[PDB]
Write a protein that holds these residues in place. Structure first.
Motif, PDB file in Angstrom:
ATOM      1  N   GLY A  57      -2.393  -3.377  -8.082  1.00 57.52           N
ATOM      2  CA  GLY A  57      -3.727  -3.636  -8.561  1.00 57.52           C
ATOM      3  C   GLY A  57      -4.086  -2.716  -9.699  1.00 57.52           C
ATOM      4  O   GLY A  57      -3.464  -1.683  -9.899  1.00 57.52           O
ATOM      5  N   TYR A  62       0.856  -1.176   0.000  1.00 53.87           N
ATOM      6  CA  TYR A  62       0.000   0.000   0.000  1.00 53.87           C
ATOM      7  C   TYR A  62       0.893   1.226   0.000  1.00 53.87           C
ATOM      8  O   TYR A  62       2.041   1.166   0.433  1.00 53.87           O
ATOM      9  N   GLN A  66      -2.549   5.862   1.084  1.00 54.53           N
ATOM     10  CA  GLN A  66      -3.102   4.604   1.586  1.00 54.53           C
ATOM     11  C   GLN A  66      -4.004   3.902   0.578  1.00 54.53           C
ATOM     12  O   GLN A  66      -5.122   3.510   0.898  1.00 54.53           O
ATOM     13  N   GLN A  67      -3.519   3.730  -0.645  1.00 50.73           N
ATOM     14  CA  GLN A  67      -4.224   2.895  -1.604  1.00 50.73           C
ATOM     15  C   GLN A  67      -3.226   2.194  -2.509  1.00 50.73           C
ATOM     16  O   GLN A  67      -2.120   2.698  -2.717  1.00 50.73           O
ATOM     17  N   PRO A  68      -3.588   1.041  -3.066  1.00 49.77           N
ATOM     18  CA  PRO A  68      -2.572   0.106  -3.558  1.00 49.77           C
ATOM     19  C   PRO A  68      -1.714   0.648  -4.690  1.00 49.77           C
ATOM     20  O   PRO A  68      -2.129   1.507  -5.462  1.00 49.77           O
ATOM     21  N   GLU A  92     -18.654  -0.704  -2.767  1.00 47.07           N
ATOM     22  CA  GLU A  92     -17.620  -1.680  -2.470  1.00 47.07           C
ATOM     23  C   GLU A  92     -16.288  -1.281  -3.076  1.00 47.07           C
ATOM     24  O   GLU A  92     -15.247  -1.411  -2.435  1.00 47.07           O
ATOM     25  N   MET A  93     -16.295  -0.807  -4.313  1.00 49.32           N
ATOM     26  CA  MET A  93     -15.039  -0.477  -4.975  1.00 49.32           C
ATOM     27  C   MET A  93     -14.468   0.864  -4.563  1.00 49.32           C
ATOM     28  O   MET A  93     -13.351   1.184  -4.968  1.00 49.32           O
ATOM     29  N   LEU A  94     -15.202   1.666  -3.800  1.00 45.82           N
ATOM     30  CA  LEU A  94     -14.693   2.954  -3.351  1.00 45.82           C
ATOM     31  C   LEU A  94     -14.166   2.954  -1.926  1.00 45.82           C
ATOM     32  O   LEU A  94     -13.355   3.815  -1.592  1.00 45.82           O
ATOM     33  N   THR A  95     -14.612   2.053  -1.058  1.00 44.98           N
ATOM     34  CA  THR A  95     -14.190   2.098   0.333  1.00 44.98           C
ATOM     35  C   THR A  95     -13.449   0.847   0.786  1.00 44.98           C
ATOM     36  O   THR A  95     -12.312   0.950   1.240  1.00 44.98           O
ATOM     37  N   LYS A 134     -12.351  -2.000  -0.748  1.00 43.30           N
ATOM     38  CA  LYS A 134     -11.232  -2.577  -1.470  1.00 43.30           C
ATOM     39  C   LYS A 134     -10.102  -1.594  -1.707  1.00 43.30           C
ATOM     40  O   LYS A 134      -9.043  -2.009  -2.167  1.00 43.30           O
ATOM     41  N   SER A 135     -10.282  -0.313  -1.419  1.00 39.06           N
ATOM     42  CA  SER A 135      -9.222   0.643  -1.703  1.00 39.06           C
ATOM     43  C   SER A 135      -8.692   1.368  -0.474  1.00 39.06           C
ATOM     44  O   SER A 135      -7.523   1.195  -0.136  1.00 39.06           O
ATOM     45  N   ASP A 136      -9.507   2.135   0.235  1.00 34.96           N
ATOM     46  CA  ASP A 136      -8.969   3.120   1.170  1.00 34.96           C
ATOM     47  C   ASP A 136      -9.370   2.900   2.615  1.00 34.96           C
ATOM     48  O   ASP A 136      -8.555   3.111   3.508  1.00 34.96           O
ATOM     49  N   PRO A 161     -13.422   7.150   2.819  1.00 36.65           N
ATOM     50  CA  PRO A 161     -12.156   7.046   2.095  1.00 36.65           C
ATOM     51  C   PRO A 161     -11.194   8.083   2.626  1.00 36.65           C
ATOM     52  O   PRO A 161     -11.406   9.283   2.470  1.00 36.65           O
ATOM     53  N   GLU A 162     -10.126   7.615   3.259  1.00 35.79           N
ATOM     54  CA  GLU A 162      -9.320   8.531   4.044  1.00 35.79           C
ATOM     55  C   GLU A 162      -8.494   9.487   3.191  1.00 35.79           C
ATOM     56  O   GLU A 162      -7.999  10.496   3.717  1.00 35.79           O
TER      57      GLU A 162
END
Ligand SMILES: [Mg+2]
Ligand SMILES: [Zn+2]
Ligand SMILES: [Zn+2]
Lengths: 79, 99, 1337
Positions: free
Chosen positions: B24, B8, B13-15, B46-49, B51-53, B77-78
């Motif tokens: 990813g 990360y 803080q995202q991949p 799901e794809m915004l919180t 699995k990501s942030d 999402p931080e």
DNA sequence: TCGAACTCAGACGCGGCG
DNA sequence: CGCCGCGTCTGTTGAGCCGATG
RNA sequence: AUCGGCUCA
């Protein structure tokens, strides 16, 4: 409902409310520990919920009535 | 190439990205329009919180998956609050009301 | 934690100290040798936090026992290290500085407040002059800037009664000194006086700003800073390198410069250094700060080591790399992968392939769970090792998990909503993602190296959404227009076309069978040929009864191939579906008919069976292409030889001077084109039908079996033009300029071609290649702007209850059929009841969904104009209703509330943009001539001539529907009479394509009065004939003696009075305009129908209509009806005294007369009638005509540009975009809001439906309507996050900061930012339940 | 702090001058 | 009112690779 | 992390 989800749509009315109803039923089977009605045939909970909706057994008001009954009767039998 | 969980970033803080460092894929805004047109609303939440942030979200999601229960507890999402601090560092009072 | 809305203000110094945790003093970051944070530096552990969890710096207390114990010797609190991300700091400036954004942004928000010009404020703040704050002496006045020189004279002349000083402190003094009440009230009261546009606009802006400061609660003096804040460390890390080097963001550098300047200026300030040192040091502090805020604005950008500018704060939010676009709207995502695609035809169209190991890497935790549940592994590490060593039980479990678990496949770019779909896996071995053939037309995928991405859905709701909304078998009708989207592509169609054809001799000729099954046996055993005509017995089912099937049998006369096909058609279709040679149009009709009758599931099964059998019987024939197939026509030498002889003769005639330059060119290109055409026709007469074969007699001719001809006829690949390239001449070629070169190519691709013929083909080839690569930029840009304007709109309410809408009519006009009524009415809902020519047949309860049967019934009658309910009129606030929109094109029924409508429309209108940049009036068909609202008169000869532009010639069929329409000029000759059946092929209207007549519909003398030559005119007698008339000079040559007198004939009677217009007392004397040179002189009449005077003569279009751009030839319209008049002449341009019948005239301005006009000095007009000529500006149409005029203009024009190239989109998707342009209004009267401020129209209609109810009679205001381009109606909206997210982030953010707005979280972008559920589609019900709970407490 | 930078271009709104 | 001139602000989307610098 | 350069659909 393995392939096409056409019948359930007419059986409830929206492509959307079907999603919420089926998700709630599959939740009840997932963790809540209830038992299915239509035979399994080695299939996941999700398609089982869709088949139940298509055949005409799990509507919305039916869910409400059934949960109300179980709640009241278990509370009354608690004492 | 294929990824299920890995590194990360540091400031946001995202991949990470690219095969060389096991990252990813990217979900650019064009796909977001595609997924809004259909009407699917849980999928891009799901794809915004989770699995990501959303940090707490992702750890508890992995716990639930390996535990046999398929559910989701979302947060914020931080990188959004990163944005809040970059704006309120300029001398502008961005700050979000409460209930 | 939960919240409702977000809010911006200005930040006051007490707030800045309230955020911070401790002052920063010295600029050292860390010791480069011992890796520890320096104290009181940009990383100090005292101020921000610890460096490791629950440890202090010196290392005395540790890890849980001392929680919160602020250690005393090093001074760092003992808590987590996820606090380096949250605590802030601050610097206390020695002297005040000025914020850039509130100074150098457009209109400055300081220069607008103080009201003094910008240049003065810079020159004060650059330390160049002084300024006077307040002079007790009244000879000077506030704000009058003073250079140092006259500052001296002021110093000795009075000395002490004045305050004058220099720098930011002066601007603080001025900004403190003034009030906000008294100026507001003075400007308010004295505004009402003189409505000069400049004065009105300036005072409105000034009042609006002052009222914003008063109402919001801010204070102006906060604009210029005196305490800076510092953002935490981890938001600006300092990353180590391999070799002791450190890479840090530019922010640390920009902060060090300010820290050093601050410390050194404080030093020089303590010792009272002489003035100039202080001046320079303060100015350098100013420059450091306002380079930190945003780099390259005030002067030149301060570069780093590498001659590249630095990265400020204000450009960590802008651009394509900032937060809002690079990192907050599109994340990176895990649980994903990508690879290379390739075909597999053994699938079924709800499946795809996965390589083993991709699926073993994506579905890992599900596998861990299943193993631990089965009891093979006790703990997680056992599962890790068992999975990595790849023991066969892992393969069994993995095959268990993926069952019934759809995945999402995506291919970028994703132009429209069919770009990602949800398939169901099948595990294979290899490295490539297999994929069905039929779904490559939707993705636009070819298998020559493309790549494709795979995602999985985790939770339990998203899995049901990937099953019920976006599976592959659920969407088979495109939402742009209900045309199916699974047409069989290119190889299956050739198999279907090679089975079902007939040869004249084959074998098994004329024997009889008992069903399709014996046909299969015969073809397979080798006793009969796959296509050899036979007669069989078949049994076909019709369900014409009340919804149930009935069977009938018969002997049909068919080949063997068709009798093989009949084994897969599914028991509801007639047999005449198969008796033909099945080009791909027939296959597409076959599928569509199955869909209409039997529903969905049979269509899926049937489409898949067609694919299988097409492949199988196309490989079984063997169909190759060889150099013997390209067949050169035999008669090709003669044609070219004759053409060359002809061109030689024309060249000979030119060299003898008989013919001009351009004439030779034109004749040469014509003769070469004719030779081309007949060579091509000879070729195709040799290919198509030349197989001559004999059976049972002499000879017959049948259509051919030439591999090129089968690949081009059925429709697999190619066309006639491209076969012509391969066999005949390949035409004429064009040079880069655009001209056509003279000597054409002559060889083709079988004979090979020469050198310079190739070097000439290269021109066009490169022009095509260069265009294809430079469309995509502005195509993508246009799609983005459309999606961003139409974003919000969603279908909210059921029935709006509004009344009438718009009216639909066919547009076959110009030529033959362009659009019937059918395609412009399927789906809408009728705005009223439509009467029928057989009356007392009412068809609706005022509104019925016009599906196919109703359009058919309406077709059987003869109506040709309906009224439908359009989304530009619906009243519901914040959305539309479910009837105005109409049919849902994809599903096939009425639309259900909760869809997203803006995004669908924008995607489906911006997706075809990739294909895009690439005399006499004759009756053509018999029918009556109909003219309505027409002024005409029988000519002197006996035929008709028109004196009214209003009507144009409508050719009408015997039933009533208009067959054709033509526009004819003024006064031209007609060869027929009104209201009679007229034969076709007839010159029904005639005029010289230059000449405009000035005929007298009235009868009497024409005598010369009012004209005296050399004043308005001159006498130009035709020296060829002798008769002419006093020539009306053009405005330029006509002198100034008669310039102010209109050149005017006086159409008189025998007595002398003016001839009145027939039936009215209006005198009719022709005030002739220019070029109206009369032919007939004094004493000579001009009767009915006699000519008094003869007056001789891509993508940016779409991206420019939707922008409300203004062209540069404004065709002025008629503001008010009635007679007109003119006035004073040529002071640059003339004036236009409009002449209302009972109204007031004086409205007039300049006039463009430099183009040929329409109206005469004494003509009666209706409002909205042209004056000069040229295209129009849409604002004019909206001002003078309603909103339906502008909608119909926009839709027909854009539809024209699209339809020129065979791209059809439905019409709703143009109307919704327009309905997102007209949502802003300006007020003219008043009563609760201000005078002329712009205003959201929905709020004005909310007010007017409140106060002008029973509460008050008339105080609710009157409003005009306003129009805006998409790039400008997107920015000026209610919410400041939906407008700061794509363009103009700093300007929007600043004008929101000053006025203290608050966002409300209603759109769809506003919620994908903060991570909530969209208010559209599935996330709808709950999202409005939230709103219900917002209201009950 | 001398050292470049160049012929992007199309559109819009503002500050001066008549 | 009407030229006429000036400084901002825009310009497709996913991926793959290797030097350069700090 | 930024910059330059080549390439794929
Ligand atoms: Mg390709
Ligand atoms: Zn300590
Ligand atoms: Zn409506």
């Amino acid at each position: 409902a393995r392939v096409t989800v056409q019948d359930a749509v007419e059986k409830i009315g929206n492509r959307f409310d079907l999603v919420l109803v089926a998700a709630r039923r599959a939740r009840q089977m997932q963790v809540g520990g209830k038992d299915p009605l239509v035979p399994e045939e080695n299939d996941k909970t999700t398609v089982i919920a869709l088949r139940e909706i298509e055949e005409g057994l799990i509507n919305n008001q039916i869910l409400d009535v059934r949960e109300r009954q179980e709640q009241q009767e278990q509370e009354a039998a608690e004492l | 190439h294929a990824r299920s969980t890995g590194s990360y970033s540091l400031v946001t803080q995202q991949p990470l990205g690219g095969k060389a460092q096991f990252g990813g894929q990217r979900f650019g805004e064009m796909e977001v329009w595609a997924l809004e047109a259909y009407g699917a609303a849980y999928t891009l939440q799901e794809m915004l919180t989770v699995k990501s942030d959303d940090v707490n979200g992702r750890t508890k999601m992995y716990k639930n998956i390996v535990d046999g229960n398929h559910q989701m507890e979302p947060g914020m999402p931080e990188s959004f609050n990163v944005l809040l601090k970059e704006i309120r560092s300029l001398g502008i009072n961005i700050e979000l009301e409460d209930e | 934690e939960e919240f409702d809305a977000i809010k911006i203000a200005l930040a006051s110094p007490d707030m800045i100290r309230s955020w911070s945790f401790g002052e920063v003093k010295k600029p050292e970051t860390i010791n480069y040798r011992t890796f520890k944070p320096e104290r009181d530096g940009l990383f100090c552990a005292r101020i921000f936090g610890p460096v490791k969890d629950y440890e202090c710096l010196c290392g005395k207390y540790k890890r849980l026992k001392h929680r919160g114990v602020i250690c005393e010797k090093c001074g760092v609190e003992v808590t987590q290290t996820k606090v380096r991300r949250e605590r802030m700091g601050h610097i206390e400036l020695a002297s005040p500085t000025a914020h850039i954004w509130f100074l150098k942004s457009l209109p400055s928000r300081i220069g607008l407040l103080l009201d003094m010009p910008l240049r003065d404020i810079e020159r004060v703040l650059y330390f160049e002059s002084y300024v006077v704050i307040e002079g007790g002496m009244t000879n000077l006045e506030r704000q009058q800037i003073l250079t140092e020189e006259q500052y001296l004279d002021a110093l000795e002349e009075f000395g002490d009664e004045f305050d004058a000083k220099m720098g930011a402190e002066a601007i603080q003094a001025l900004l403190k000194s003034m009030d906000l009440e008294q100026e507001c009230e003075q400007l308010r009261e004295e505004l009402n006086e003189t409505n000069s546009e400049t004065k009105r606009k300036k005072l409105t802006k000034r009042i609006k700003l002052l009222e914003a400061f008063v109402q919001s609660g801010n204070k102006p003096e906060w604009m210029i800073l005196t305490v800076l804040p510092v953002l935490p460390p981890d938001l600006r890390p300092l990353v180590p390198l391999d070799g002791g080097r450190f890479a840090t963001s530019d922010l640390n550098d920009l902060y060090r410069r300010v820290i050093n300047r601050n410390n050194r200026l404080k030093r020089l300030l303590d010792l009272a250094a002489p003035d100039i040192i202080v001046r320079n040091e303060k100015r350098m502090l100013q420059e450091a700060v306002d380079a930190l805020l945003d780099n390259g604005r005030r002067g030149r950008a301060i570069t780093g080591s590498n001659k590249r500018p630095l990265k400020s704060l204000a450009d960590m939010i802008k651009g394509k790399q900032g937060r809002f676009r690079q990192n907050l709207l599109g994340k990176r995502v895990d649980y994903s992968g990508r690879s290379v695609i390739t075909v597999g035809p053994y699938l079924r169209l709800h499946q795809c392939g996965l390589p083993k190991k991709m699926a073993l890497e994506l579905f890992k935790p599900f596998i861990y769970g299943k193993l631990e549940l089965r009891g093979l592994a006790t703990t997680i590490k056992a599962a890790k090792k068992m999975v990595e060593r790849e023991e066969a039980v892992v393969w069994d479990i993995l095959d268990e998990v993926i069952r019934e678990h759809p995945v999402l496949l995506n291919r970028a770019p994703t132009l429209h909503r069919l770009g990602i779909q949800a398939f169901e896996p099948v595990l294979i071995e290899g490295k490539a993602i297999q994929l069905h053939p039929l779904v490559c037309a939707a993705y636009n995928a070819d298998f020559d190296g493309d790549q494709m991405a795979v995602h999985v859905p985790l939770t339990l709701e998203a899995q049901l959404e990937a099953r019920a909304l976006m599976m592959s078998t659920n969407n088979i009708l495109s939402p742009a227009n209900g045309e199916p989207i699974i047409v069989p592509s290119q190889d299956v169609v050739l198999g279907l076309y090679y089975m079902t054809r007939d040869c004249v001799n084959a074998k098994g000729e004329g024997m009889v069978l008992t069903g399709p099954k014996e046909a299969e046996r015969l073809y397979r055993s080798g006793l009969a040929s796959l296509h050899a005509r036979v007669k069989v017995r078949i049994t076909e089912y019709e369900k014409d009864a009340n919804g149930e099937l009935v069977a009938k049998t018969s002997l049909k006369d068919t080949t063997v191939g068709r009798a093989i096909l009949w084994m897969i058609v599914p028991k509801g279709l007639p047999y005449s579906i198969v008796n033909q040679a099945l080009g791909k149009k027939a296959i597409s009709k076959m599928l569509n008919t199955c869909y209409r009758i039997l529903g969905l599931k049979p269509t899926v099964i049937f489409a898949d069976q067609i694919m299988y059998t097409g492949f199988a019987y196309a490989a079984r024939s063997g169909a190759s292409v060889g150099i013997d197939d390209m067949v050169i026509p035999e008669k090709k030498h003669e044609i070219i030889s004759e053409a060359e002889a002809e061109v030689a003769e024309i060249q000979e005639q030119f060299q003898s001077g008989l013919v001009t330059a351009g004439e030779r060119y034109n004749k040469v290109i014509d003769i070469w084109a004719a030779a081309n055409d007949r060579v091509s026709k000879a070729m195709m007469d040799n290919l198509q039908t030349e197989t001559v074969i004999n059976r049972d007699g002499q000879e017959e001719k049948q259509v051919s079996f030439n591999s090129i001809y089968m690949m081009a006829d059925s429709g697999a690949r190619g066309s006639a033009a491209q076969i012509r390239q391969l066999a005949g001449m390949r035409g004429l070629m064009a040079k880069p300029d655009g001209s056509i070169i003279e000597t054409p190519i002559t060889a083709n691709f079988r004979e090979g071609l020469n050198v310079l013929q190739y070097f000439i083909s290269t021109h066009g080839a490169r022009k095509g290649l260069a265009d294809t690569a430079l469309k995509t930029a502005n195509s993508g840009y246009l799609t983005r702007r459309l999606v961003d304007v139409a974003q919000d709109l969603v279908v909210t309410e059921d029935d709006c209850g509004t009344h009438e809408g718009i009216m639909m009519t066919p547009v076959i006009e110009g030529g033959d059929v362009k659009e019937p009524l059918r395609d412009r009415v399927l789906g809408r809902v009728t705005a009223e009841d439509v009467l029928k020519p057989g009356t007392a047949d009412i068809l609706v309860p005022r509104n019925t969904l016009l599906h196919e049967q109703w359009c058919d019934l309406l077709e059987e009658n003869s109506v040709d104009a309906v009224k439908v309910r359009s989304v530009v009129s619906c009243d519901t606030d914040f959305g539309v209703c479910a009837h105005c929109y109409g049919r849902d094109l994809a599903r096939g029924h009425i639309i259900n509330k909760g869809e997203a409508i803006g995004v669908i429309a924008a995607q489906s209108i911006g997706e075809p943009g990739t294909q895009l940049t690439m005399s006499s009036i004759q009756v053509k068909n018999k029918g009556s001539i109909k003219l309505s609202n027409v002024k005409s008169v029988v000519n002197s000869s006996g035929k008709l001539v028109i004196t009214s532009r209003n009507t144009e010639l409508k050719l009408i069929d015997e039933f009533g529907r208009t067959k054709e329409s033509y526009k004819v000029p003024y006064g031209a000759v007609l060869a027929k009479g009104d209201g009679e059946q007229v034969a076709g092929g007839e010159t029904v209207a005639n005029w010289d394509p230059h000449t405009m007549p000035v005929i007298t519909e009235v009868s009497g003398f024409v005598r010369f009065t009012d004209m005296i030559d050399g004043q308005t005119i001159t006498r130009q007698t035709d020296e060829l004939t002798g008769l002419s008339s006093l020539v009306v000079l053009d405005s330029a040559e006509r002198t100034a003696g008669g310039k102010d007198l209109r050149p005017a004939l006086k159409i008189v009677d025998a007595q002398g009075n003016d001839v009145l217009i027939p039936g009215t007392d209006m005198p009719a004397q022709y005030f002739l305009p220019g070029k109206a040179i009369v032919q007939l002189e004094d004493g000579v009449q001009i009767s009915s129908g006699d000519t008094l005077a003869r007056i001789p003569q891509g993508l940016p279009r779409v991206a420019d209509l939707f922008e409300a751009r203004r062209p540069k030839e404004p065709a002025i319209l008629a503001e008010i009806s009635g007679i007109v008049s003119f006035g004073k002449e040529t002071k640059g341009k003339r004036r236009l005294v409009i002449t209302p019948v009972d109204g007031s005239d004086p409205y007039e301005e300049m006039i463009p007369k430099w183009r040929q006009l329409n109206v005469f000095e004494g003509e009666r007009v209706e409002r909205g009638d042209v004056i000069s000529d040229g295209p129009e500006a849409p604002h004019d149409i909206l001002r003078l005509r309603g909103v339906h005029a502008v909608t119909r203009y926009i839709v027909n024009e854009v539809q024209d540009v699209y339809r020129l190239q065979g791209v059809k989109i439905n019409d709703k998707h143009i109307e919704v975009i327009v309905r997102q342009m007209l949502r802003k209004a300006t007020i003219v009267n008043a009563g609760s809001s201000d005078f002329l401020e712009g205003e959201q129209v929905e709020y004005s209609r909310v007010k007017i439906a409140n106060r002008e109810l029973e509460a008050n009679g008339k105080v609710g205001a009157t409003y005009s309507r306003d129009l805006l381009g998409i790039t400008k109606a997107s920015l000026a909206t209610e919410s400041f996050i939906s407008a700061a997210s794509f363009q103009e982030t700093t300007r929007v953010l600043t004008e929101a900061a000053v006025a203290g707005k608050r966002d409300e979280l209603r759109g769809l972008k506003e919620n994908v930012i903060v991570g909530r559920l969209i208010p559209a589609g599935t996330g709808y019900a709950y999202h409005q339940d939230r709103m219900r709970r917002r209201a009950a407490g």
